[PDB]
Ligand binder design. Structure first.
Ligand SMILES: Nc1ncnc2c1ncn2[C@@H]1O[C@H](COP(=O)(O)OP(=O)(O)OP(=O)(O)O)[C@@H](O)[C@H]1O
Lengths: 614, 443
DNA sequence: ATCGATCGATC
DNA sequence: GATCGATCGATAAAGTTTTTTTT
């Protein structure tokens, strides 16, 4: 009587696929969304569906959707039969799956006793210690070679590695098998562990866990180490007796009841597990809006006023961080050197000032950009250093805030308090884009494509004026020449600037005084530079002859003698002298370089090298 | 069936009748040359592979291995007319396949990839030695016919039966010792090399089963990439996880090549040709009988850097090398040349060493801090759970022409520099820390 | 050495 | 054809002082 009930829910779901759940006509929301679900599928060939719990609850008014919530451990090989019937009548090698999502409620892992056998229950948590990608079987072509091995049984169970039922002729049944790798189609899966979220533990009371199984295309979508949700079918799996290997406290005490099956007397257990079907991980005219916004005029000056509300003034350093926010060029000469790919700018200043606000600003504003103080200069992190032999091997790679800044903008501060050894290590990491390691293992060829951001401390907390920063750099010489220039933030105590900064901070520190207007928003600026990165402007004019005389004049200035200091701005900086010069034209969306654009390029070192040169 | 018999006729024509790039019989020339060295190998050109897949894409990505078995027997007749009686020595040939237009890492494998051609990279971890493999199972009964012919044993499946074509009893099958040849077998397991990988995560494992004339081409520690087929072995028994409807993974191989560098090419410098057969060796003499070559080569060696001349005189001289001239029962002679640069911070000294790493044949780039005082030379890695203290060398035993950067890592300068200045003085240095007294040879 | 499973023989 | 008896095959084991880099 559940056969016709299974046949009732077969067509009632099929009739639901004939209709839509569309409430608005031609104000958006085109009708018959499930027909278009078939239409997108017959082009890209992904072999999925996507159904929600809402629109099937609001057709039979819960007379049908409440039935499948307690039975679809059995009803799951029923609804697949109906959609397999409707696909030939509506569309032209075909394996599918049933992907519910978005049930209303969300539980924790501590609430699974008796109703959770055959139900659907969305479960939160985090995920740790994944595994690999192996194939599964679900259907055999195996049969004995007595007379003919073409018997195709199906539905290999949790231990059924032996299809031995109903041969064609009266051959030797259950005598043998031969698992054909030809016709028996497979599917791919993995087995990962989960863990409970941090904001629910009462105390440090050994937070328990369980294990899941991902079956369909859902493999590799579950990035480990994030807050995540799941589908919710439950299952129990024993495995103690098979053909191969021979199968504390009184765990498995219920197993003694489970004895005496029709095959050999044993002690079969039953351990709780979990199966999923679908994962999620929480945590036009807009394309025409860029074409309107690219046809503006003063966007170089519009953007610099609209960077950060937590800062006032300092219009020199606001220009520099925006060029750091975008990227330059990286394509270079053939068969050999890969040149620079970016700029690297620092600002030193007195602590507990407006230096710390940009560092707060960028790490949410930038894609995947990490922040690290860089004080733990002992174990790992900034310094790269492998881990000891653990669980099957030494010489394994480690994390740290350079490798995961691959096209990411890392920011480290406090240069003074590190040791004397890493100051060549990151100096190696700065000049080209790879680092090398050979500590007790083979050489490693890893290429952290990075662009750093720095803020060190002065030698006394107050910057002197009449001297240079050659004393006040508080480090060695050649890393500064390896670096770009700075535009150090100055300080003063005037009667006027403190008053306006006081008014600048109180409306910010209001709960709601949003009268300040940045002429852009955050995200429309964010997608704007994503349009800006898709060019490659090349200098084509003959202003390179104009270019070479400026540096040739420039090098005769900072060298104030044959015995003058070794801060001689050499041919290393000429690459930055053009790779910033293209990037500022890459901001204004111009695909070639004019001599007018490099006017702001020349003085930007030069106004800041006269900051060096007294 | 029977139309595959004509397939061998349909490709021996389609291969041997013409080779591209203005004829010259390129593939028709490299056959006899590897016949001369007696080394049992062939190649296929990718552009020929691009042209010999038009009717064969549905016979490469559909059926990769039994297409090759019928592809193997035509190559005998492709050279039997050329070299007669070559089958009387070693009686066997098998082909190898060159590069392929895929870039698969270790992570990206699914069900659609199996029983087809695959290509993947990684690094070689812990490896075994060389065993012989039976390869021709002359089956043996006890009372009936005890010679069932030399079989064709598979991979790790132990292909046998209880009784067939003699009786139906439980008489087991045994062995005997007449004329069973052996190929060898060497199961390198592979770890994913931490290059192109989203970092901060774990490595992943596979297994690789090599074959007969491809043994010990790799060395432990060195980066390799492999081109072969994919296979499955549903053994129905696994004991790390529970027994489950799953199946393992075995990657058999057809070819193997060394680490590559500057992966930006389109048609060259990824396949190690290095095969100076006709168009090169006939050419390379007149380029040697000119009058200003040494004034031309070292000027044209490092093209990207104009600079002062004398370094390019020296650094070209360094990788050209001298001679390890041995002598009678007396002291040996160093056959090496060891330059040392000194530069201002900002001249091009970091690039010539970077560029010469590509233009060499083998190299290493242990630079700066983190170079261990022992990890350059050989070190002993401790045993796993039932093993012995074995010897697993690091940088200098692998590199014959290695490149270090000993500038001023002063905190570790008093550690490692007592272990590099006896690689030159008492050349071929090795050590016996808590292990075996041995002496490896590293020039 | 003991227990379980499979095969053969007898009713 | 089914049931009972006899013979053959498969099933049970255990760890925690020296030595490496590292902080
Ligand atoms: N003579 C030159 N010709 C061409 N390019 C040069 C020259 N000198 C320096 N450069 C450029 O300057 C860039 C900076 O790298 P550089 O070679 O100066 O590092 P380095 O100072 O040698 O580093 P280290 O001192 O650590 O070895 C290089 O990418 C290189 O292209």
């Amino acid at each position: 009587v559940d056969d016709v009930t299974g046949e009732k829910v077969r067509e009632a779901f099929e009739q639901f696929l004939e209709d839509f759940s569309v409430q608005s006509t031609d104000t958006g929301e085109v009708e018959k969304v499930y027909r278009a679900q078939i239409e997108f599928m017959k082009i890209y060939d992904l072999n999925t569906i996507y159904i929600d719990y809402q629109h099937l609850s609001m057709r039979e008014n819960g007379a049908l959707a409440m039935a499948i919530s307690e039975q679809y451990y059995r009803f799951l090989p029923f609804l697949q039969k109906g959609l397999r019937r409707v696909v030939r009548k509506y569309a032209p090698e075909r394996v599918f799956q049933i992907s519910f999502f978005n049930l209303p409620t969300v539980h924790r892992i501590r609430d699974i006793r008796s109703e959770k056998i055959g139900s659907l229950l969305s479960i939160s948590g985090t995920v740790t210690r994944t595994s690999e990608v192996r194939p599964e079987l679900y259907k055999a072509s195996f049969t004995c070679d007595m007379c003919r091995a073409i018997v195709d049984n199906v539905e290999q169970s949790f231990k059924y590695t032996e299809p031995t039922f109903c041969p064609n002729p009266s051959c030797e049944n259950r005598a043998f098998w031969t698992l054909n790798v030809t016709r028996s189609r497979f599917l791919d899966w993995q087995k990962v562990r989960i863990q409970e979220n941090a904001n629910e533990i009462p105390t440090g009371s050994m937070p328990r866990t369980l294990d899941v199984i991902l079956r369909g295309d859902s493999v590799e979508r579950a990035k480990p180490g994030d807050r995540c949700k799941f589908t919710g079918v439950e299952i129990v799996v024993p495995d103690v007796t098979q053909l191969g290997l021979p199968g504390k406290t009184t765990e498995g005490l219920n197993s003694g009841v489970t004895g005496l099956r029709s095959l050999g007397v044993r002690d079969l257990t039953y351990k709780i597990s979990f199966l999923a079907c679908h994962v999620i991980s929480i945590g036009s005219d807009e394309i025409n809006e860029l074409k309107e916004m690219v046809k503006d005029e003063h966007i170089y000056d519009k953007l610099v006023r609209s960077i950060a509300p937590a800062v006032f003034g300092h219009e020199a350093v606001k220009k520099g961080i925006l060029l750091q926010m975008l990227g330059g060029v990286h394509k270079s000469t053939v068969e050999g050197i890969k040149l620079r790919g970016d700029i690297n700018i620092c600002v030193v200043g007195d602590p507990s000032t407006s230096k710390s606000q940009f560092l707060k600003y960028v790490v949410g504003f930038a894609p995947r950009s990490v922040y690290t103080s860089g004080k733990a200069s002992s174990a790992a992190g900034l310094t790269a250093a492998v881990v000891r032999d653990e669980e099957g091997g030494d010489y394994t790679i480690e994390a740290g805030a350079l490798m995961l800044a691959d096209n990411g903008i890392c920011c480290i501060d406090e240069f003074d308090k590190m040791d004397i050894s890493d100051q060549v290590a990151i100096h190696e990491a700065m000049e080209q884009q790879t680092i090398s390691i050979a500590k007790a293992g083979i050489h490693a060829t890893l290429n952290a494509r990075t662009s750093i951001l720095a803020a060190a401390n002065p030698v006394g907390g107050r910057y002197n004026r009449k001297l240079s920063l050659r004393g006040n750099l508080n480090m060695t010489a050649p890393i500064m020449s390896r670096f770009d220039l700075f535009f150090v933030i100055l300080d003063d105590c005037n009667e006027k600037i403190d008053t306006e900064l006081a008014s600048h901070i109180v409306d910010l520190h209001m709960k709601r005084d949003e009268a300040i207007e940045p002429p852009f928003s955050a995200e429309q600026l964010r997608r704007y530079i994503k349009y800006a990165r898709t060019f490659k402007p090349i200098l084509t004019k003959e202003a390179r002859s104009y270019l070479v005389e400026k540096y040739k004049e420039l090098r005769k200035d900072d060298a104030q003698g044959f015995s003058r200091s070794s801060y001689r701005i050499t041919v290393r900086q000429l690459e930055s002298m053009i790779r910033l010069s293209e990037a500022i034209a890459r901001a204004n969306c111009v695909d070639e370089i004019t001599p007018s654009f490099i006017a702001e390029a020349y003085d930007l070192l030069r106004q800041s090298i006269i900051r060096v040169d007294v | 069936p029977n139309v595959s018999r004509t397939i061998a006729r349909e490709l021996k024509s389609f291969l041997l009748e013409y080779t591209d790039e203005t004829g010259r019989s390129v593939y028709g020339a490299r056959i006899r040359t590897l016949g001369e060295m007696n080394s049992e190998s062939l190649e296929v050109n990718y552009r020929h592979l691009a042209e010999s897949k038009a009717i064969l894409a549905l016979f490469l990505a559909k059926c990769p291995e039994e297409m090759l078995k019928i592809f193997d027997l035509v190559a005998m007749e492709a050279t039997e007319l050329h070299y007669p009686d070559y089958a009387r020595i070693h009686s066997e040939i098998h082909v190898r396949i060159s590069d392929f237009p895929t870039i698969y890492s270790l992570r990206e494998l699914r069900e659609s990839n199996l029983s087809s051609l695959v290509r993947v990279t990684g690094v070689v971890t812990r490896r075994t030695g060389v065993f012989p493999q039976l390869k021709y199972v002359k089956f043996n009964c006890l009372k009936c016919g005890s010679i069932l012919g030399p079989f064709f044993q598979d991979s790790n499946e132990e292909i046998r039966i209880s009784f067939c074509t003699n009786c139906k009893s439980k008489g087991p099958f045994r062995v005997n010792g007449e004329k069973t040849v052996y190929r060898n077998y060497q199961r390198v397991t592979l770890q994913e090399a931490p290059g192109t990988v989203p970092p901060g995560r774990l490595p992943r494992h596979r297994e690789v089963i090599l074959l007969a004339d491809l043994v010990d081409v790799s060395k432990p520690g060195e980066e390799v990439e492999v081109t072969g087929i994919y296979k499955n072995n549903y053994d129905g028994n696994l004991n790390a996880k529970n027994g489950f409807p799953v199946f393992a993974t075995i990657i058999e191989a057809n070819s193997i090549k060394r680490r590559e560098g500057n992966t930006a090419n389109e048609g060259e410098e990824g396949l190690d040709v290095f095969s100076w057969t006709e168009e090169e060796e006939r050419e390379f003499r007149k380029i040697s009988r000119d009058r200003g070559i040494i004034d031309k080569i070292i000027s044209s060696m490092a093209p990207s850097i104009y600079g002062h001349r004398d370094i390019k005189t020296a650094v070209a001289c360094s990788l050209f090398g001298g001679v390890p001239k041995n002598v009678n029962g007396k002291h040996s002679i160093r056959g090496d040349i060891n330059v040392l640069l000194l530069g201002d911070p900002g001249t091009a000294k970091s690039q010539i060493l970077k560029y010469v790493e590509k233009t060499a044949h083998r190299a290493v780039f242990a630079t700066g801090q983190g170079a261990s005082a022992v990890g350059l030379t050989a070190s002993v890695r401790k045993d796993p759970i039932t093993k012995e203290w074995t010897l697993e060398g690091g940088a200098l035993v692998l590199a014959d022409k290695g490149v270090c950067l000993i500038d001023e890592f002063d905190k570790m300068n008093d550690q490692d520099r007592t272990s590099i200045h006896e690689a030159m003085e008492q050349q071929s240095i090795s050590i016996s820390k808590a292990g075996i007294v041995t002496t490896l040879q590293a020039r």
